[PDB]
Amino acid sequence: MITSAAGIISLLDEDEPQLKEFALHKLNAVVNDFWAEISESVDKIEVLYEDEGFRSRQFAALVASKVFYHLGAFEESLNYALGAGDLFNVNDNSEYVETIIAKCIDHYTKQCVENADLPEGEKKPIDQRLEGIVNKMFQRCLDDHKYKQAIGIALETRRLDVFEKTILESNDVPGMLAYSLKLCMSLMQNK
Amino acid sequence: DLYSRYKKLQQELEFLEVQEEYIKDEQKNLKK
Amino acid sequence: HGLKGLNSKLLDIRSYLEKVATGKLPINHQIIYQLQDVFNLLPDVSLQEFVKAFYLKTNDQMVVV
């Protein structure tokens, strides 16, 4: 097939925006195979993303996140997925979206526990946008009616607010309350 | 349900690690 | 344990030297003599012969191991 992204990546160098956006689109189309060459030429895509004057911030961040996913970074990839704004799709249920959501969930839970103990200091930025992705997953799970799972993720994140909202707007408040009571009595450790 | 079993798995994996260190220490003491 | 003992002993000798330097006790030319004998007896490691021999015999030790 294309057999090389050299042409497209070299073309992206040119200032012509229209060209730049179309090259970004085609790179997103063919990322799955040429992630290695794209990796080699990330630098320029980083410039394209960071210079917010260019009106493809979300697309640049998304493609960078996908590339770093293919590489295996999974951290700067995560930040780029976060910077993709809302351009990222969540209901596509692709492998890439699913795994990045998993990374978001675990990372966010980590900062949640961290702050959980921290009385007020540190109060990590919790990139409100990361909060946004976790909330979006919350509503998607609510739509799928996984009240158990919403409740438990809320517990892990310490998000008593989301936990209470899901339990209240659950399918059976008494059974949900009994399940939550059991989990609190047995599994919960932090006093 | 799913998370009940997930956290049970957490508990038992941790406890199994504790078993590993138990047996290593006890093996040393038994050699002595 | 031997390292700890050596460290404690040199802590002691340093403390005494500090007392003398402050003048809390009289200079004992004999104890001095002994101390500068010790220092004079300290070896040289970067001698470029000692080091070659050291590497050679360490090589033999590692070979057997």
Added chain:
Amino acid sequence: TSGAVLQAATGMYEQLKGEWNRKSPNLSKCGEELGRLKLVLLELNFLPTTGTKLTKQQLILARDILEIGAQWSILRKDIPSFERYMAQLKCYYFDYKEQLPESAYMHQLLGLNLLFLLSQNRVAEFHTELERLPAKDIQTNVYIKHPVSLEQYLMEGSYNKVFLAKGNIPAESYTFFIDILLDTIRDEIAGCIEKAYEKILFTEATRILFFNTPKKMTDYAKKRGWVLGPNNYYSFASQTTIPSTELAKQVIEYARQLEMIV
């Protein structure tokens, strides 16, 4: 609007082709015409990306505009433009081999890229594109052959023969890339004399390093000038501590491994 854009591009390229090459305008007007046709290609089939099977005029338009943009990059000595346009040229030539006919003006430009790579000294990628070439074309063609023979000479070391072989240029397009190759040769001999040929004097240096006048080599002393020794010998090829702590770590680790119950 497919036909509309097609005919627009065709007319634009016809005007360009007619003007820039037949005569030699070779003007910023030609460059802007290239930019216009590039913006056209943008919406056009573009790098086909496969999955199209149109046999669209994409062939004509893209191949010709890319080749012309490459030669334009050459004329302007703009290496970034040259490399990008030749990257698209590869993506076109080597991707859709069967769906496309031979590009009569392909081997010439590709051999010129051979010269480009040799001049930049990017020998690894040079050999990669060699091997990607068909085997017979390595020798049958003259455009392809000449850079290859020059590269063999350079690898051998017969730099005198390399310089002698300046004239034998299959196409005048091989211009100024020869000069990049020359100064790359100069840098190569510079490293040569640096790490070998201990304490070479000025006269030997000048005769061997085919620089310009001795004043120009005094200028070339800008190239870190070595030290010029006492007699402009350009200096020369410039040329314990018991690793106790690390070796202690190593042996402690040996004991640790020997010792755990595991």
